[PDB]
Amino acid sequence: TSCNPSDMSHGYVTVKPRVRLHFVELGSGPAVCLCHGFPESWYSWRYQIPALAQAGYRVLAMDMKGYGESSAPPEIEEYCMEVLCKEMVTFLDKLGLSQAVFIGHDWGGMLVWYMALFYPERVRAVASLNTPFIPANPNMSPLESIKANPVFDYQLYFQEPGVAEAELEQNLSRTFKSLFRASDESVLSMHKVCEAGGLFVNSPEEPSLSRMVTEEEIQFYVQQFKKSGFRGPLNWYRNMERNWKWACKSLGRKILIPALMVTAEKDFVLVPQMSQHMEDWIPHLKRGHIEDCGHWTQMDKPTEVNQILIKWLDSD
Amino acid sequence: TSCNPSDMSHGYVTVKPRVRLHFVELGSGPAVCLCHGFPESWYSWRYQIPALAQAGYRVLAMDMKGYGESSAPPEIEEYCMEVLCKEMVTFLDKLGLSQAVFIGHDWGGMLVWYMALFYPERVRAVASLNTPFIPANPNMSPLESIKANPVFDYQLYFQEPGVAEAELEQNLSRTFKSLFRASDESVLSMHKVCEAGGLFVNSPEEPSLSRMVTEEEIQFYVQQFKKSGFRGPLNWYRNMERNWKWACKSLGRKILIPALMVTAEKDFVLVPQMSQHMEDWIPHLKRGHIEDCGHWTQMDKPTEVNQILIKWLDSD
Ligand SMILES: CCCCC/C=C/C=C1/C(=O)C=C[C@@H]1C/C=C/CCCC(=O)O
Numbered sequence A, B: 001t002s003c004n005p006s007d008m009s010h011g012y013v014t015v016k017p018r019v020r021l022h023f024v025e026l027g028s029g030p031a032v033c034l035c036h037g038f039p040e041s042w043y044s045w046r047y048q049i050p051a052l053a054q055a056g057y058r059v060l061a062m063d064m065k066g067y068g069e070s071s072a073p074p075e076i077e078e079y080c081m082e083v084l085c086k087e088m089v090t091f092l093d094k095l096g097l098s099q100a101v102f103i104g105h106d107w108g109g110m111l112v113w114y115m116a117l118f119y120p121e122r123v124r125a126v127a128s129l130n131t132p133f134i135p136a137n138p139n140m141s142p143l144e145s146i147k148a149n150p151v152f153d154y155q156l157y158f159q160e161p162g163v164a165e166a167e168l169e170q171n172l173s174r175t176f177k178s179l180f181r182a183s184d185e186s187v188l189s190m191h192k193v194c195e196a197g198g199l200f201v202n203s204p205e206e207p208s209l210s211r212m213v214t215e216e217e218i219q220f221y222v223q224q225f226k227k228s229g230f231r232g233p234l235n236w237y238r239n240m241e242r243n244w245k246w247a248c249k250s251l252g253r254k255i256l257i258p259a260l261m262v263t264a265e266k267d268f269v270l271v272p273q274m275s276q277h278m279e280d281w282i283p284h285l286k287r288g289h290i291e292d293c294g295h296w297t298q299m300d301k302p303t304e305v306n307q308i309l310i311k312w313l314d315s316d
């Protein structure tokens, strides 16, 4: 069902002087590049990697920039979509891949949509878990839309360098145990986070283990976030204006490659209806939907995700 | 094109607890595994890697065990063909590859033949540069046949641990410059070695650069061999009796998969006539022959090698 880390092939590509990307590689056939969200790991794909490899695909599961064994420079702007996307292009180039299928989740989903938008020639097909494609509005700056949405208040808590880092870094076991839970097991404070104290303030000093994860799984994440901590990961969130500026340069060009949007019923931040008018911009869009599935889609509902991904990969 | 190392994707697979194999990877398509000889590197395939990738192949060029970034344990028996082949099967297993084409040269070529003989289900097709397949004789150990050939005297000089190590390691740049030359430029001393005072008696202290290589190329080999020296590499030559016993367990089976033997006119050790009658063991054997080509085949005639390999890959 899953991956044992020391049993994988581990690859490293230098995409620029400062920066190498690590990834794990399994399988033969068309290249499928898996891109995780915040605050995750290649390992978040642990149930998909063997499944897609067995279905006849060559899987490359990334540590995204800021995570795991990939470099984690401290500057905020090293994590804007524009920089991350160019770097993913160089990654392909150095591997001698002219294209790959890109599949992302959360921030990885965002990334893959912008890859499809700006580098369609390098993207065979694109799929997102939970993250919709929303075209930028040149009259709506990002900070206004985020204030309108109360469940997005945690993104404001993430802006100030050092603040979310100190809470997240305080106790890594507690961090991951409090984050990685089914929606019904969650006690995260998302709505008035700065004023509440932080994300974890109404959550135990020793949380129980979610039914989704084992202690061993939790400890792999703990160990992975020792090397660089949370700064780079959090920087993904600190480029809103820059990313908005870059997206407005699309100037309504349309994604024409095959595309798959998978929504999760119980993701309370990336809610299904935020995807609702994607076919106005991607008319051939295909969809999948997973009941009883929270934010941590690949872990919560691995069987359903695998089924949806393999069916789509095999047809489009 | 050749290859620039820091522009490559580097892969690492742990084949057993304290043994990991390094490789470089380029291209999409059917997996082709390149296996170098003594005393070389993945970098000996520098001209084939991009040619083969451009031709539609996914190239994995290994550091073989003992070399470069791969593990180099000191024990002689870690480098017998039986141990080396089972590790390559495990390599494929961990990469999720049910098969690959195996292309070897010199000791790598010996390895690919044992892979094709003993693990044909994992070898889609096999190609060797210079190294013939020789059926083992269950009576005469090759001991006497090795003694019979004067140009294999260097192999006897390689037997005693530490002796050839000291000569080869004394001045790495002189080693590689003395080794890596077209056959017409060689001044290697191969017949009387144990007695006559080492491989390099006739070599200038500062040899000129063969027309086949640049200084920067030579220096890459120097840097590689600083990590683990010559003991692992030399251990490849120190398992003749074990290899002969393993090969006798083949009980005269044939190699039934697609196979290519490439001879080199001016290799004076792996002479072309040594491949005569290979088709009696290998029904689907194709052939290639390179004129004016010495032992360092990939480097001496890279254009002819590329053409020969690609044509055979595309047909068989
Ligand atoms: C900083 C961590 C980013 C992870 C984003 C959390 C996402 C999603 C969740 C759910 O979809 C369900 C629980 C978490 C947080 C949302 C909580 C809403 C209040 C809990 C409830 O009453 O259901």
Ligand SMILES: CCCCC/C=C/C=C1/C(=O)C=C[C@@H]1C/C=C/CCCC(=O)O
Pocket: B038, B039, B154, B179, B182, B183, B186, B187, B188, B189, B190, B266, B267, B268, B269, B294, B295
């Ligand atoms: C032991 C280190 C590996 C060296 C294997 C050398 C292989 C092959 C050669 C040739 O095919 C041609 C030159 C080298 C060594 C053979 C030399 C014979 C004497 C040179 C001469 O003709 O005067």
